[PDB]
Amino acid sequence: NSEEDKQYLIFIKVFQQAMKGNFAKIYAKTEEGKDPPIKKKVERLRAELNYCYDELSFKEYLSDFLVRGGLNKYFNEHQEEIALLIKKSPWQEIRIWSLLAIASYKPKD
Amino acid sequence: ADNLVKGIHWWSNFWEKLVIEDSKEYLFNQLFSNREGFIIMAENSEEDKQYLIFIKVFQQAMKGNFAKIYAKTEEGKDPPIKKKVERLRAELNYCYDELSFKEYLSDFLVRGGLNKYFNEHQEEIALLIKKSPWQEIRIWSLLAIASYKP
């Protein structure tokens, strides 16, 4: 119902899977008994997400973060819908959705 | 008596008669003279329970607000607690729709501080606020203000 909301939910899932990929990357990078920075990484992500000055800024960051996430199936299923959602829509609402995803990935683990 | 004969709840609509209909306060004064009696019957009313808990919640919130005013009150000066109560009645009566009244009620509850009763009956009071028509919640808030007794 209200396919725009469906696209919004699948975008939330896409961002969650991308952050999962980046978490796997940082967990692979850390070595020895050092505590893998996850809280630090999450706070850094939130701080960089808040820091943005329209259009090019934070959209370049969104795309770069999604690429850093790597293989993401939810984005694989739906190409045109998410591509149009990212190209369209005011960037602030995309920021809202991404921050909600930040808080909604924790269900996964 | 009529409601009793009818077999229906005595508290069919006392407030309506006491205030809404009785602008002159002919029986509203009787309410003032018999407010305890009204509460007594309301106590008998089990359904009232939830509204009684809300009454206690609002009384705790206004206790917190009055404590804040007491802290704000300068030494020697007389705090305007009566004036603040009159302001509370006027502000509540000013609210004209569900959104504005719920805004003011939630803001007042937040300003009250930590409320024990609202903590114990979180879900029940939350659902009562969400469901009940805002006019009814305003009525019971006015009763809470009138029934405040430290």
């Binding site: - | 809404i20 602008s23 009566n93 000013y94 004209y96 729709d97």
Partner: protein, 285 residues
Amino acid sequence: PNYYLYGTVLTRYGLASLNHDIRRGNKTILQKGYWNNGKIHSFVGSSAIRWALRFYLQKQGYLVNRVWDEEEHINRLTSEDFDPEKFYDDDIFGFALLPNQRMGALGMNMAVSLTPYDGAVKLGAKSGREKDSTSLHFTEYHATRYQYYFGIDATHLKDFSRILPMIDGIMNLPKVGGSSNIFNYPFCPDSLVFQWTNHFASYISYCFEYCDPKSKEAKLSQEFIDEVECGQIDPSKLWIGGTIVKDLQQLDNFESSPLNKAHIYRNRNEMIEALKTVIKRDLGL
């Protein structure tokens, strides 16, 4: 025969506070009640429009038994004995002094608000630092189009020619009792649905509905259009004019629906002229 005139009228969009009921405390509540879908709507009483018609008949120069002294704000009687033969108001609106009484040709219903009343209020306060008990006050208002239903009996009129001034007054209704100082709401019609038939049965009562709960759209109701489709309410006896004409003409398949063969005029004056010509032909005037 037995000819009657029925109509449902819609007003323009504006802020209205025309029917303050018994006020409480400091707020002047405007009278309201329930209506379609269970949402509260604001009502303007039919007695107000009857008074407005009386005032129109007084101003245009007709006899009118009840004279309204504007400066005195008082009502006087030209003659203590009601004479419906001579007085237009006694002929149309009837009387009862407590012959003695008249049924009254004009039968009007209340003026409902097309849009439900949210509860908007306005604060007013006396200026100056010198403030007293009468300093500040709240007045309730509503931004709505108003709709009322009326029905008259042409045969019941003692003089049949009196139907023309009443129609002219409805189309040129003076101020309807309200608060013109701070809410000057014109009650002039902007969309009519008139029926002039010999049968009594009327299916045009409150035939207007809103597109959105908070909007100035004023589309025709589905029930009225469907009933015109089904076969009753003959289009030859239908008279629709005003702003709703545009919406009707923008409807799909309009050239095939029975609404096409009904008297529809964009300009209200033209439709009124045609209906008046029809009435004068029918009643031998």
